[PDB]
Amino acid sequence: SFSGYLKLTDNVYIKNADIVEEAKKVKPTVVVNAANVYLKHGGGVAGALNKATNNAMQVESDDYIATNGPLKVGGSCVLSGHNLAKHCLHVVGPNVNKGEDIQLLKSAYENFNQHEVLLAPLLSAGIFGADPIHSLRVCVDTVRTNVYLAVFDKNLYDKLVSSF
């Protein structure tokens, strides 16, 4: 079970933690990946989750893309969680540094509603370029299931909690 989380709402929890370390500790049913449409896990949360699976997440993802083609921005797919979780829900939030519509962030969070409980990062935050305060607001206003948010950066975590 999840420990050390600060309760924000009835169903949204938050902790200053490395999502990879959190995944290895809890081994949740679902870990959310901050994915791109091609499932190319190069950097940010995706690169870090993929490196923890010894690249097994990338090999599985390339086979998925070869069969199904790319995901949509705002969409998702369920793949193996490997050594991190039972499953990994690869969710594509809009990448602001690629001109993608920030309005698609609500659609991306709607994917979380298909899972009772999830360990997740803030969608479109970090190298995706969106404001993390805005991502947290869309998360609490869109997700109805139990979401345990891992925020890597302490300074950002403090800013998110203090401004909520």
Question: Interface residues with ligand S2S (CB under 6 A)?
Answer: 18-20, 44-45, 48, 121-122, 125-126, 151-153
13 vs 152, which CB is nearer to ligand S2S? 152
28 vs 121, which CB is nearer to ligand S2S? 121
33 vs 76, which CB is nearer to ligand S2S? 33
User: Is the CA virtual torsion 30, 135, 157, 144 positive or negative?
Assistant: negative
Q: Could you tell me the smallest distance in angstroms from the CB atom of residue 157 to ligand S2S?
A: 9
User: CA 50, CA 130: separation in Å to the nearest integer?
Assistant: 22
Q: Could you tell me the smallest distance in angstroms from the CB atom of residue 45 to ligand S2S?
A: 4
User: CA 17, CA 149: separation in Å to the nearest integer?
Assistant: 9
Q: Could you tell me the smallest distance in angstroms from the CB atom of residue 124 to ligand S2S?
A: 9
118 vs 125, which CB is nearer to ligand S2S? 125
Q: Is residue 98 exposed (0-12), middle (13-18) or buried (19+ Cβ within 10 Å)?
A: exposed
Q: Which residue is nearest to ligand S2S (CB)?
A: 126
CA 108, 30, 77: angle at the middle one, nearest 5? 45
Check if the beta carbon of residue 157 is closer than 8 Å to that of residue 4: no
Q: Could you tell me the smallest distance in angstroms from the CB atom of residue 110 to ligand S2S?
A: 19
